[PDB]
Structure 1
Amino acid sequence: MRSAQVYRWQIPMDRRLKTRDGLYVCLREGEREGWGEISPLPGFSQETWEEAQSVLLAWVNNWLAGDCELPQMPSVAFGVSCALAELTDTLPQAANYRAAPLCNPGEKVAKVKVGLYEAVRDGMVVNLLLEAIPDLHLRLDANRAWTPLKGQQFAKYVNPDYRDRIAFLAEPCKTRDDSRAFARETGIAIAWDESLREPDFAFVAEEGVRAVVIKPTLTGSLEKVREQVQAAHALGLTAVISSSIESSLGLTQLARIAAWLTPDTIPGLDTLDLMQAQQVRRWPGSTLPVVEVDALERLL
């Protein structure tokens, strides 16, 4: 016997993004229970919050009637599939809560957002960090920020002898041909990110490419995310499971999907401190308050 609940919320963030708005699905079959988060990201997700809601509510009504197509809309396919996996006890409880800290115990790994302004500033900060911590490895996020020139102007400031400790620079340039060229000229390893979510992306052996970054809320189902992880691992690449700024609930399932699918790869989930509260599920060690389901706006 099936039942379902949908919640709508907005969490305050630490004039771009002052709230994060989203949704939870709770599927219930017999005594079992599954949750999932549907939170499309403004500027990044194609579909909107309110479109997400419509499709989520409609899909749920289908689910109650026993039919089992999932929507191909990324945010909804994702959350709906997390709920479905929790129903069947398949998503293990084990999770990777180890952080590659942003900003700007084991393998030391950090994350730097680059390409925001001057290429110079980024390479300088990058060099500084790698110089100070001899065993630090860095993950860099460009989001296609650079012309070939700026791709060169950034690397200008990074000691070639530390460059092997940049695990990846994601999407340095505006075209993939230029990012590949930057990899070759600079000997700096690259990752694809936004390329993966554009139509007709192929997993292909490319010299210089060592990682892919997989954002599940912008990709779709957990089944599709898995697929992309397996494709990468066949090519020898690192699959990083990453945050699309999900609430604590989605972040903990991303943590769980990481341990399950990319067990030795720290996920890119250090986005909780951007927000002012957790909801439903705790992230271990966060002292941010926790909103109970009790207090969530219920649409279904």
Structure 2
Amino acid sequence: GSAMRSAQVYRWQIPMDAGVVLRDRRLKTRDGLYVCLREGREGWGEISPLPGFSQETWEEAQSVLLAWVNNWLAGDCELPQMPSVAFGVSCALAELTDTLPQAANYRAAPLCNGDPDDLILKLADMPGEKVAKVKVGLYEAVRDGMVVNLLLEAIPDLHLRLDANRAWTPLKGQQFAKYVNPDYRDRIAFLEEPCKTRDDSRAFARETGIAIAWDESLREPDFAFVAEEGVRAVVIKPTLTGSLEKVREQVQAAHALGLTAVISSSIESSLGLTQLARIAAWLTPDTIPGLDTLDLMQAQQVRRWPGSTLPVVEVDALERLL
């Protein structure tokens, strides 16, 4: 019957597997925070800004987080605006009020790489809807186009999500596309951020008939959700976006425009990842999310991703700030 508020803040570091790289830079460890709010009821959230993506640092988020909690303890207050903090806190609040739904599915489009032939074998064995993610733009455009074509030709019901991370010039995008049989192009579910500039990405999409998606663009100042020929999806990374409510607004905006919205990982620990999976099952029920990042990390913490065999660090082992 208690309406008594209490809270805890945890600070942590999860070792990454060797060789992880983010935007051509190495990532040794994943630093982050959790918040646990109690009212009589309990809710959790993950506050883990991502170096090189987030504007704020781990340390800054920590400060903002602690201050917000200090306020919440006295009664309801405005959300933080700092995105990682807003996300984690808003999730914790949602759990408290039981407004973040539970989900059946904890799924992710698998991030694929390596030998093309071996990949074919693996894809061939996928059950249900065959959707997979492949990074492009590391090799040269010809190689990427030929390999995508190989994969598409090999498995008629395969749908590939690609990600160029703004790698290409208009010419390189053309060189890539030339190698993909036009009859298969529709099975490129979307190609994230093909070109160096958004204008060029838009030209690519309109000119090649290959669907594109925005990702990084969503976080740039002045971004606007809009219907554009050839734009088929948006990639929403909650941790880099802000509140659960802002996230939901973004999904709604996308849907309103007939775009697919994909909930995507910012390399959160298992805790935040499970929350993303729930957000996805709730808000984007027909779109498998981009959450295949747990396997980059050495351990899970607090909350388990079903099916994972990674070791679990329990709350009692985490550093408490409060």
- Tell me the CA shift for residue 201 of structure 1: 1.4
- Tell me the CA shift for residue 67 of structure 1: 3.8
Map Cα deviations across residues 44-81 of structure 1 (whole Å, 9 max, x no partner).
11101111111111111111121421111111100010
Distance in 1 of aligned mates of 2:148 and 2:98: 42
1:96 touches 1:266 (CA, 8 Å); kept in 2? no
Distance in 2 of aligned mates of 1:15 and 1:206: 32
- Tell me the CA shift for residue 108 of structure 1: 0.7
Map Cα deviations across residues 126-176 of structure 1 (whole Å, 9 max, x no partner).
122112111000011122111111111221221111110001001111221
- Tell me the CA shift for residue 125 of structure 1: 2.4
Aligned twin of 1:102: 111
1:7 touches 1:298 (CA, 8 Å); kept in 2? yes
- Tell me the CA shift for residue 271 of structure 1: 0.5
**CA 1:193/1:15 → structure 2, altered by over 3 Å: closer, same or farther?**
closer
Map Cα deviations across residues 166-190 of structure 1 (whole Å, 9 max, x no partner).
0100111122111110001111001
1:95 touches 1:255 (CA, 8 Å); kept in 2? no
1:96 touches 1:258 (CA, 8 Å); kept in 2? no
Aligned twin of 1:26: 36
1:11 aligns with 2:14: yes
- Tell me the CA shift for residue 207 of structure 1: 0.7
TM-score by length of 2: 0.90
- Tell me the CA shift for residue 122 of structure 1: 2.2
Distance in 2 of aligned mates of 1:83 and 1:172: 35
What secondary structure does 2:191 align onto?
A: strand
What secondary structure does 1:6 align onto?
A: strand
- Tell me the CA shift for residue 119 of structure 1: 2.3
For the aligned residue pairs, the C-alpha RMSD in angstroms reads: 1.5
Q: List alignment gaps of at least 5 residues for structure 1.
A: none
**Corresponding residue pairs, total:** 299
- Tell me the CA shift for residue 9 of structure 1: 0.7
Worse-superposed segment, 63-72 or 114-123? 114-123
1:35 touches 1:86 (CA, 8 Å); kept in 2? yes
Worse-superposed segment, 221-230 or 169-178? 169-178
Distance in 2 of aligned mates of 1:142 and 1:2: 46
1:75 aligns with 2:84: yes
TM-score by length of 1: 0.97
Worse-superposed segment, 54-63 or 12-21? 12-21
1:95 touches 1:252 (CA, 8 Å); kept in 2? no
- Tell me the CA shift for residue 99 of structure 1: 2.6
What secondary structure does 1:223 align onto?
A: helix
1:95 touches 1:257 (CA, 8 Å); kept in 2? no
What secondary structure does 1:196 align onto?
A: helix
1:140 touches 1:166 (CA, 8 Å); kept in 2? yes
1:195 aligns with 2:217: yes
Map Cα deviations across residues 193-217 of structure 1 (whole Å, 9 max, x no partner).
1111111211111110111110000
Distance in 2 of aligned mates of 1:103 and 1:19: 22
Worse-superposed segment, 56-65 or 118-127? 118-127
- Tell me the CA shift for residue 15 of structure 1: 6.6
Distance in 1 of aligned mates of 2:247 and 2:206: 28
- Tell me the CA shift for residue 95 of structure 1: 4.6
Distance in 1 of aligned mates of 2:160 and 2:78: 40
Worse-superposed segment, 219-228 or 5-14? 5-14
Sequence identity (%): 100
**CA 1:181/1:48 → structure 2, altered by over 3 Å: closer, same or farther?**
same
